Design a protein around this ligand. Structure first.
Ligand code: CLA
Ligand code: CLA
Ligand code: CLA
Ligand code: CLA
Ligand code: CLA
Ligand code: CLA
Ligand code: CLA
Ligand SMILES: CCCCCCCCCCCCCCCCCC(=O)OC[C@H](CO[C@@H]1O[C@H](CO)[C@H](O)[C@H](O)[C@H]1O)OC(=O)CCCCCCCCCCCCCCCCC
Ligand SMILES: CCCCCCCCCCCCCCCC(=O)OC[C@H](COP(=O)(O)OC[C@@H](O)CO)OC(=O)CCCCCCCCCCCCCCC
Ligand SMILES: CC1=C(/C=C/C(C)=C\C=C\C(C)=C\C=C\C=C(C)\C=C/C=C(C)/C=C/C2=C(C)C(=O)CCC2(C)C)C(C)(C)CCC1
Ligand SMILES: CC1=C(/C=C/C(C)=C/C=C/C(C)=C/C=C/C=C(C)/C=C/C=C(C)/C=C/C2=C(C)CCCC2(C)C)C(C)(C)CCC1
Lengths: 52, 141, 40, 75, 40, 81, 31, 75, 143, 729
């Protein structure tokens, strides 16, 4: 998670819609946090189904 | 069933062989006796070398073993009609599959019980409306 | 994006709720359901 | 094709600055441009005994015959 | 010979020959009498 | 699971279905309904994939061996994974 | 005249009733 | 190959072919519209297909009418 | 007296006249357009000036669909009748298929020539039993 | 695994197919495990309740969004110059350009304009404020709640209806004719007379006053006596102005035909009178059948009594044949409903009932296309369920020798003559079209075979259209059909003889050619569907096909090859021809009405004869605005329709993939992908719970058809809407 969340900042930070605003880094951060939340849900669901 | 013997064919490896299913679910084995070291087509792609004497080979599916068996019995100078095919479970349990009673099924044999037999023509199956709200189809009755 | 109709703060949170939360939750429930291997 | 779909969606939404284009998020064919430039400089340099470029599609003057243009650089 | 005759009598040769004959007829009839949209 | 493979009484015992079957679903068993004194049998339909080679092979006026595809298993789907 | 915020919120509460009844009909039809 | 030949046709009509003036001004066939239109699918549907199909459909009553006929025939 | 009021004869339509004074030549004859402007003037046109045809059945427009219908039906009856008789004759020649792919040109031309009496032969085969076969003597599929 | 619980076979499937098929067979209750007939009917009853409730909730959403985010009260003032809006847009994806483009129709925020004609409907029936629409939507919330609860309750054992209750056809027919159809039409005539008609005359009638304000000054006295003519009274004058009392009458039941001069729609008093008469007839008809009082008919006796010397057993046992086959019943319902849905489509555009809806050309086009497509789906489903009947429910011994079995007995004749009519139509319609195309191409358009549709013009004359001068029936004043003094005749003639509406649009050779294209399409779709239904039990390739069910992949490559052998495949093939037929008919309608609204009828009249005119003058030209919804220069309110046009093209082309390329190639590719996953480290940590496999053969056909149809409908909808809206008729 450390590795993945660290590098997941960049894409939206430099290319997302907030890149040309005064909230470029905040927009990248928000996108990365939402992505990590969805990925956590996916990981947990996989674990819930595969180890019954 | 007991234990299986035979030497693995001379082969360097393919990507077409066994996958996780072989260890997790089921696998198949084919044994055959060859008169010499001869090249044959690997059902998973490539050419392999069978050895003189006994040969055991593990394949992913029963149809692959049967395709190899037809190739052995149809494409070799002295024909090889000696191959036996088994189903191998991950528990170590081995199950003899082919040929069932020691005789190829193409030719008749005593002591065989007919299965799937229908004592009528196709055109004598009942009408589905006569069997609806059961669970059966006109061939199952 | 705005709205002059009554209670125009409702799409503000309902559009994310209908587009993100509702599908995520229902797909997760249906996923855990169709994969459920309880006998029967 | 995904780049095309992204550009269609961005332009439809009135967001031209978010498109892939020479005036927004540029995707310059840098290597092909460099090879075109190398071709243009070949006559007299890396091609000493060549008077002109092998093909004016790589660059140079706009060769025109009659009212039409025969061949010119292709950016 | 007999083989050449049996070949010239085959179905594609005969169908193309008849199509050519009919096309000649139609083309020439429209050459001498064009634009017959209907009978006077 | 598996498919269903039925053999009807129009069987002439030519055995071509057994030779065509690439998974050893069929056998020949003794019978007295035809001159060949043999009838096809499907004692191993759990291995049957349903490729219909037997039906392709059958010579009788409309097939004497009939494959009805049914519940799909990894053996019946021809899966090697 | 224009609908009021109270009217919008009152309709959501009312819609909570068809929601519960649809849940009940769904789960019973599952039986 | 359909995409390849469409690319060739449009690029040559936009950024290559055209009329040169006695002054030297180059007025291309479709006025250099490739850079902003060929980046979206709607651009290819409108400025390439729909726009340049105007000759094939209006070809009736002229020498190019067989081309419109074969157009419909291919469809 | 006032039928087809939405149509006027092409000789009375100004659009038809303005277009017919520019009718294009059809063949090598430079008077084919004038021949068109003469011939089509008798039929009914319309606002656009293009001649309209009347398949209504009235004999004042018998040339619009009746005469061509008779001609086509005659030719097509001839074709089908001679082909069918060729097939019937060939059927009893021990190997009809080979004669269906390799034509029996003598018999074929003979059957084609005797096709001008095809309606008489059709009626004659109907009154006997050569035209229509009985249903229980025809193969069918299960119901 | 558990899912799906109604099929052990699918439940034990170890592949992803298990999922797909579990979704695809849910509603086929008959093939659930352990299903009985009684449980079947009970589950269907409760599903029906759920479906009605869903309909009510949908209508509630429409009412609610018009009342909350629309411009209903403003649109009522200036209904010809204001565009009705459906609901507000909330999309965080929008940029400034799109925000500007969609704050339209006077709105102060992004909005879509409605094309369902719902504003005209709600305004015509007497609603005038947002509060009324909101109260309606809350009431529909309650009605849906009631039907949902009823559906739940009838699954409870004590309230579970018996099979004999479901099989009581006589009582249900009586109730549905007299009560469901009759009393509903009566109550609607009461709403018209009490609310809608007074509202149209400037009077308010709502729950606050409707008790103390009669619909007529005389009130019920003439009804219970003779003197019914008092209600025909003084009708609204020609100068009546909708919503005000200027020129308003007092009558409640009239029969003056024609259209309201200002609103260009049927008179509300005519509509009320129609519903009263229909109510009377339906109530009378709902007494035909026997129930609990000896009087009444047995449908079984009627069917058994109708035998002829030339139809064998006649209709014997058809009562049980239909009463025991839900697929026969559903096919009948679907066919009849599709016919009357096409009827609705043909009459609403021609004889509209909602005030000012005729001048709203995009709504008219959209509603016509909508109802025609619904009709096509309904017809295809009708024939598909007829095939399912033949497969699952048809009984040869009880239906022996009757008309049903006799249809199978000569099925080869039916199929062959359908083939012949399709070939006839196709050959010759295509030949005339191509002749016209070539003859116009070479610069000699005078040599076109232009057949005047004399028969339909003559029919128009029989109804009064004097344009053609046929002088037959209602086009001849001396006719006994026109010398009757019918109160509707002056208005009907005045409407049908003005070239200002869509009442019997003038027709010419283009209409002839497209009508034969329509005949070809109907015949070929019917041929496919009927060949599938009549061969579903068996042919010579598959003499035992009834043992293989309605839907199955094939019969293998043997016996010549048997791709698309099942009757389901016949449905799937016929779907393409239905979509093609509807394309032709909607092209015809849209182009003709484009000319009508633009005043330039000459374009369609002179260029619908050759197909290049259809190509350029209809498809190519009317795309100009649609295709410029977004361009390098900016964005307008047509941007959504342009993007949807492209979206439909994409979905259609995507379905081509499933249709053209069949399954084994994909299974091998998926096997390579499975190997790639099982051997890639880190990814090896994760494994699929279901074995990935290629989509099945039937699944492929269905998914490809679904993409084909979605793309079809969306492409044409975006085109129709955007062209008619950018041009404004
Ligand atoms: C499939 C339907 C169809 C039909 C209805 C027509 C019909 C027609 N076309 Mg057209 N056309 C079609 C398809 C069709 N076309 C297609 C697909 C194309 C694209 C290739 C064209 C392109 C086209 C062109 C370019 C032209 C036409 C023309 C014509 C007209 C010329 C007729 C004529 O005089 O020829 C010949 C007339 C005959 C009578 C020939 C038959 C003679 C037979 C062989 C002799 C038999 C007589 C018999 C012995 C008598 C016995 C009588 C019995 C009672 C005993 C005609 C009305 C021409 C025109 O100018 O239109 C006005 C023309 O130039 N068409
Ligand atoms: C379209 C894809 C995309 C995009 C747009 C970006 C965009 C970006 N990336 Mg990312 N990246 C990507 C994909 C992408 N990345 C992928 C696929 C990977 C591989 C998984 C990476 C992995 C990667 C790493 C490892 C880093 C970035 C970083 C960055 C940012 C560097 C630019 C900058 O701000 O300058 C400034 C850059 C720096 C100041 C570098 C940080 C220096 C620190 C102090 C490290 C010092 C090294 C040393 C070992 C200290 C450790 C101390 C320890 C002993 C206690 C930038 C916004 C950097 C970043 O996030 O900025 C903090 C960075 O560290 N990227
Ligand atoms: C089936 C009818 C229907 C439809 C198609 C829509 C459509 C829409 N609504 Mg609306 N809504 C409806 C009924 C409906 N509404 C009713 C009756 C109410 C009053 C309770 C509301 C109150 C409501 C609010 C407050 C808002 C919307 C909004 C929206 C838009 C965004 C989606 C959303 O957030 O919804 C959310 C919906 C709800 C919170 C209430 C549930 C709606 C009904 C009662 C349930 C429908 C169930 C349906 C029949 C199940 C069948 C599904 C089928 C596929 C099987 C969208 C265009 C948003 C908007 O205006 O966008 C700008 C917004 O914020 N709706
Ligand atoms: C009396 C006036 C007249 C004149 C000025 C012409 C002039 C011409 N004709 Mg024409 N023709 C005429 C009458 C006339 N014809 C009549 C009455 C018919 C009806 C039978 C035809 C049918 C006809 C056909 C079918 C052809 C010509 C062709 C030609 C050109 C080549 C002449 C030639 O002999 O080369 C060579 C001649 C031929 C290849 C065919 C000779 C025509 C005979 C009468 C019919 C034989 C066809 C056969 C029975 C069936 C076709 C099978 C095929 C393998 C040949 C030439 C400029 C040919 C052409 O157009 O060149 C491309 C050609 O193909 N004409
Ligand atoms: C007067 C008593 C009565 C009434 C009111 C009803 C009413 C109804 N029954 Mg019921 N039934 C009754 C007695 C009654 N039944 C009895 C005694 C029995 C036992 C013998 C049954 C047994 C029975 C069964 C088993 C079922 C029904 C079902 C239904 C529903 C049919 C589906 C539907 O909603 O379409 C509504 C139809 C109409 C409103 C009229 C048809 C409209 C026609 C086709 C054309 C449209 C006219 C007009 C142009 C529309 C305007 C359009 C508008 C948008 C402007 C319906 C609401 C079905 C159901 O859904 O269960 C919940 C069902 O399964 N009934
Ligand atoms: C109107 C009443 C009606 C009733 C209640 C039924 C009932 C039934 N039908 Mg029938 N049918 C109908 C109408 C009806 N049908 C129509 C109108 C058609 C023509 C299309 C058909 C044609 C038909 C066939 C060919 C078959 C059935 C079958 C069945 C049975 C199985 C249903 C099932 O589980 O499938 C579930 C359905 C699906 C999984 C697919 C749903 C497709 C959705 C609605 C469309 C998706 C649209 C897309 C997502 C839009 C994207 C939008 C976005 C891009 C913007 C079932 C008992 C099947 C059967 O079992 O035979 C006995 C069968 O083979 N029907
Ligand atoms: C434009 C596309 C197209 C065309 C032309 C056809 C054509 C036809 N379809 Mg078809 N179909 C199509 C698409 C098409 N289909 C698609 C996408 C599907 C879904 C997969 C179907 C599925 C389908 C089914 C299931 C059935 C048909 C049927 C038919 C026939 C109906 C009879 C008719 O039209 O009259 C006459 C025929 C025509 C007008 C077409 C022939 C046109 C040629 C040009 C005539 C001239 C011959 C030509 C000169 C030959 C010389 C070749 C040489 C030059 C090389 C007809 C031949 C029905 C049928 O078989 O009818 C009995 C039928 O059952 N179609
Ligand atoms: C492919 C299948 C092949 C074969 C199978 C086919 C089967 C049949 C299928 C379809 C058939 C369709 C119907 C075809 C017939 C259409 C008839 C038609 O078009 O007619 C068209 C004609 C047109 O001529 C009419 O002439 C009349 C003169 O009065 C009319 O009034 C009109 O002026 C004029 O339109 O109409 C008539 O039928 C004339 C009827 C005159 C006599 C009416 C007798 C009944 C009335 C008697 C008096 C009543 C009241 C007296 C008045 C006052 C005192 C109370
Ligand atoms: C628009 C064109 C329509 C194209 C349809 C297909 C054209 C092919 C012609 C079909 C001939 C069928 C041969 C029948 C074979 C036959 O002759 O059987 C003989 C049959 C005699 O049987 P009986 O009538 O004595 O049988 C008693 C009945 O109780 C049972 O049928 O006579 C008829 O059925 C005549 C009706 C045939 C016409 C079919 C009806 C078609 C349209 C029906 C319109 C309904 C209107 C109802 C309004 C109240
Ligand atoms: C004592 C009694 C009688 C007196 C009755 C009196 C004194 C009044 C009766 C009034 C009645 C019976 C009113 C009935 C109203 C029914 C309605 C309103 C039904 C359905 C509405 C629906 C289904 C939904 C409509 C929709 C809504 C909500 C919209 O807003 C949009 C349109 C649409 C979608 C259609 C008399 C003496 C007579 C007989 C003897 C007994
Ligand atoms: C498969 C099948 C089926 C079927 C299905 C379907 C889909 C059908 C259909 C069909 C149809 C879809 C039909 C239609 C029809 C129509 C009609 C029948 C009409 C009638 C008419 C009339 C008679 C009219 C008349 C008139 C006129 C014209 C005008 C003036 C007025 C009058 C009225 C005189 C069933 C299930 C059943 C059974 C099983 C099998």
């Amino acid at each position: 998670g450390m590795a993945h969340g660290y590098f997941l900042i960049g894409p939206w930070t430099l290319l997302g819609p907030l890149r040309d605003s005064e909230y470029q880094y905040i927009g990248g951060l928000i996108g990365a946090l939402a992505l990590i939340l969805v990925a956590t849900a996916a990981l947990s669901s996989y674990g819930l189904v595969t180890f019954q | 069933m007991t234990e299986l013997s035979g030497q693995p064919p001379k082969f360097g490896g393919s990507t077409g062989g066994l996958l996780s299913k072989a260890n997790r679910e089921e696998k198949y084995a084919i044994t055959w006796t060859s008169a010499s070291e001869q090249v044959f087509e690997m059902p998973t792609g490539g050419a392999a070398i069978m050895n003189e004497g006994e040969n055991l080979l593990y394949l992913a599916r029963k149809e692959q073993c049967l395709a190899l068996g037809t190739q052995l019995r149809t494409k070799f100078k002295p024909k090889i009609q000696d191959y036996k095919i088994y189903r191998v479970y991950p528990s170590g349990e081995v199950q003899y599959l082919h040929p069932a009673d020691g005789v190829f099924p193409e030719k008749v044999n005593e002591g065989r019980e007919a299965q799937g037999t229908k004592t009528r023509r196709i055109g004598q199956n009942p009408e589905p409306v006569t069997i609806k709200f059961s669970g059966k189809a006109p061939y199952e009755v | 994006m705005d709205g002059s109709y009554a209670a125009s703060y409702l799409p503000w949170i309902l559009i994310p709720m209908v587009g993100w939360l509702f599908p995520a939750v229902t797909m997760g429930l249906l996923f855990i359901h169709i994969e459920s291997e309880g006998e029967g | 094709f995904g780049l095309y779909i992204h550009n269609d969606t961005m332009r439809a939404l009135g967001r031209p600055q978010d498109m892939f284009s020479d005036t927004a998020i540029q995707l310059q064919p840098i290597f092909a441009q460099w090879v075109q430039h190398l071709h243009t400089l070949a006559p007299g340099a890396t091609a000493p005994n060549a008077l002109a470029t092998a093909s004016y599609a790589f660059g140079g003057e706009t060769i025109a015959v009659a009212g039409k243009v025969a061949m010119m650089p292709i950016t | 010979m007999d083989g050449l005759k049996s070949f010239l009598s085959t179905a594609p040769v005969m169908i193309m020959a008849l199509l050519t004959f009919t096309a000649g007829i139609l083309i020439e009839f429209n050459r001498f009498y064009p634009d017959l949209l209907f009978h006077p | 699971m598996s498919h269903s493979v039925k053999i009807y009484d129009t069987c002439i015992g030519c055995t071509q279905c057994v030779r065509a079957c690439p998974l050893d679903v069929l056998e020949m068993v003794p019978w007295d309904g035809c001159k060949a004194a043999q009838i096809a049998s499907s004692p191993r339909t759990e291995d049957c994939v349903g490729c219909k080679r037997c039906e392709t092979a059958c010579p009788t006026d409309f097939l004497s061996i009939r494959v009805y595809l049914g519940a799909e298993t990894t053996r019946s789907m021809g899966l090697a994974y | 005249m224009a609908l009021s915020d109270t009217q919008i919120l009152a309709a959501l509460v009312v819609a909570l009733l068809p929601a519960f009844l649809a849940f009940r009909l769904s789960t019973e039809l599952y039986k | 190959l359909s995409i390849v030949i469409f690319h060739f046709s449009w690029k040559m009509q936009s950024d290559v072919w055209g009329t040169v003036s006695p002054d030297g001004s180059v007025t291309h066939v479709t006025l250099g519209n490739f850079a902003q239109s060929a980046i979206t699918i709607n651009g290819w549907l409108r400025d390439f297909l729909w726009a340049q199909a105007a000759n094939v459909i209006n070809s009736y009553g002229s020498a190019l009418s067989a081309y419109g006929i074969m157009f419909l025939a291919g469809h | 007296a006032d039928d087809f009021a939405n149509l006027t004869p092409c000789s009375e339509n100004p659009a038809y006249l303005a277009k017919s004074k520019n009718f294009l030549n059809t063949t090598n004859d430079p008077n084919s357009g004038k021949i068109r402007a003469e011939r089509y003037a008798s039929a009914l046109c319309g606002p656009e000036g293009y001649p309209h045809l009347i398949v209504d059945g009235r004999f004042t427009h018998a040339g619009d669909f009746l005469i061509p219908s008779i001609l086509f039906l005659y030719i097509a009856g001839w074709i089908g009748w001679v082909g069918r008789s060729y097939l019937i004759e060939i059927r009893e020649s021990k190997n009809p298929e080979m004669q269906e792919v390799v034509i029996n040109v003598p018999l074929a031309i003979k059957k084609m020539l005797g096709g001008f009496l095809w309606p008489l032969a059709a009626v004659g085969e109907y009154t006997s039993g050569k035209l229509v076969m009985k249903d229980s003597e025809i193969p069918t599929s299960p119901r | 695994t558990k899912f799906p619980k109604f099929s052990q076979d699918l439940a034990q499937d170890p592949t992803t197919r298990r999922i797909w098929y579990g979704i695809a067979t849910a509603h086929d209750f008959e093939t659930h495990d352990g299903m009985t007939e009684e449980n079947l009917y009970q589950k269907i009853f409760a599903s029906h309740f759920g479906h009605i409730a869903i309909i009510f909730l949908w209508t509630s959403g429409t009412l609610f969004h018009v009342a909350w985010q629309g411009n209903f009260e403003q649109w009522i003032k200036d209904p010809l110059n204001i565009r009705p809006i459906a609901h507000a847009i909330w999309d965080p994806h929008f940029g400034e350009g799109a925000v500007n483009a969609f704050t339209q129709a006077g709105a102060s925020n992004p909005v879509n304009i409605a094309y369902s004609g719902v504003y005209h409907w709600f305004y015509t029936i007497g609603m005038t404020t947002n509060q009324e629409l909101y109260s309606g939507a809350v009431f529909l919330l309650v009605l849906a709640s009631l039907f949902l609860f009823a559906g739940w309750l009838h699954l409870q054992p004590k309230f579970r209806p018996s099979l004999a209750w479901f099989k009581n056809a006589e009582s249900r027919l009586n109730h549905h004719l007299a009560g469901l159809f009759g009393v509903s039409s009566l109550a609607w005539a009461g709403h018209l007379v009490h609310v809608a008609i007074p509202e149209a005359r400037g009077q308010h009638v709502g729950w606050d006053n409707f008790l103390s304000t009669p619909p007529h000054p005389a009130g019920l006295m003439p009804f219970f006596t003779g003197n019914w003519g008092v209600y025909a009274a003084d009708p609204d004058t020609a100068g009546h102005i909708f919503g005000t009392s200027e020129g308003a009458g007092t009558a409640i039941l009239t029969f003056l035909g024609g259209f309201h001069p200002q609103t260009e729609s049927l008179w509300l008093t005519d509509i009320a009178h129609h519903h009263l008469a229909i109510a009377v007839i339906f109530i009378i008809a709902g007494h035909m059948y026997r129930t609990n009082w000896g009087i009444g008919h047995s449908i079984k006796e009627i069917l058994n009594a109708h035998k002829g010397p030339l139809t064998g057993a006649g209709h014997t046992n058809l009562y049980d044949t239909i009463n025991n086959s839900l697929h026969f019943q559903l096919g009948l319902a679907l066919a009849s409903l599709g016919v009357i849905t096409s009827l609705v489509a043909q009459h609403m555009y021609s004889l509209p009932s909602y005030a000012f809806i005729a001048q709203d050309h995009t709504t008219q086009a959209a509603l016509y296309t909508h109802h025609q497509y619904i009709a096509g789906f309904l017809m295809v489903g009708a024939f598909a369920h007829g095939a399912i009947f033949f497969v699952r429910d048809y009984d040869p011994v009880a239906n022996k020798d009757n008309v049903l079995a006799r249809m199978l007995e000569h099925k080869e004749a039916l199929i062959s003559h359908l083939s012949w009519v399709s070939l006839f139509l196709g050959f010759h319609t295509l030949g005339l079209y191509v002749h016209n195309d070539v003859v116009v191409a070479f610069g000699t358009p005078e040599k076109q075979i232009l057949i005047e549709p004399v028969f339909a013009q003559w029919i128009q004359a029989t109804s009064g259209k004097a344009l053609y001068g046929f002088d037959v029936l209602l086009s001849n004043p001396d006719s006994i059909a026109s010398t009757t003094g019918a109160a509707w005749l002056p208005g009907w003639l005045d409407a049908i003889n003005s070239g200002t509406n869509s009442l019997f649009l003038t027709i010419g050779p283009g209409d002839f050619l497209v009508h034969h294209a329509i005949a070809l399409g109907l015949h070929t779709t019917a041929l496919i569907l009927i060949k599938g239904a009549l061969d579903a039990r068996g042919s010579k390739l598959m003499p035992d096909k009834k043992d293989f069910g309605y839907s199955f992949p094939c019969d293998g490559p043997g016996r010549g090859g048997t791709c698309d052998i099942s009757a389901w495949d016949a449905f799937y093939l016929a779907m393409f021809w239905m979509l093609n037929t509807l394309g032709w008919l909607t092209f015809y309608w849209h182009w003709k009405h484009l000319g009508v609204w633009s005043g330039n009828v000459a374009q369609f009249n002179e260029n619908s004869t050759y197909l290049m005119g259809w190509f350029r003058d209809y498809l190519w030209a009317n795309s100009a605005q649609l295709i410029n919804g977004y361009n390098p220069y900016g964005v307008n309110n047509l941007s959504v329709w342009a993007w949807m046009f492209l979206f439909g093209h994409l979905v259609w082309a995507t379905g081509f993939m499933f249709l053209i390329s069949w399954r084994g190639y994909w299974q091998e590719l998926i096997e390579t992908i499975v190997w790639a996953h099982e051997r890639t480290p880190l990814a090896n940590l994760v494994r699929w719970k279901d074995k990935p496999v290629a989509l099945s053969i039937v699944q492929a056909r269905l998914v490809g058809l679904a993409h084909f149809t979605v793309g079809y409908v969306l492409t044409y909808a975006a085109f129709l809407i955007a062209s008619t809206a950018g041009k404004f008729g």
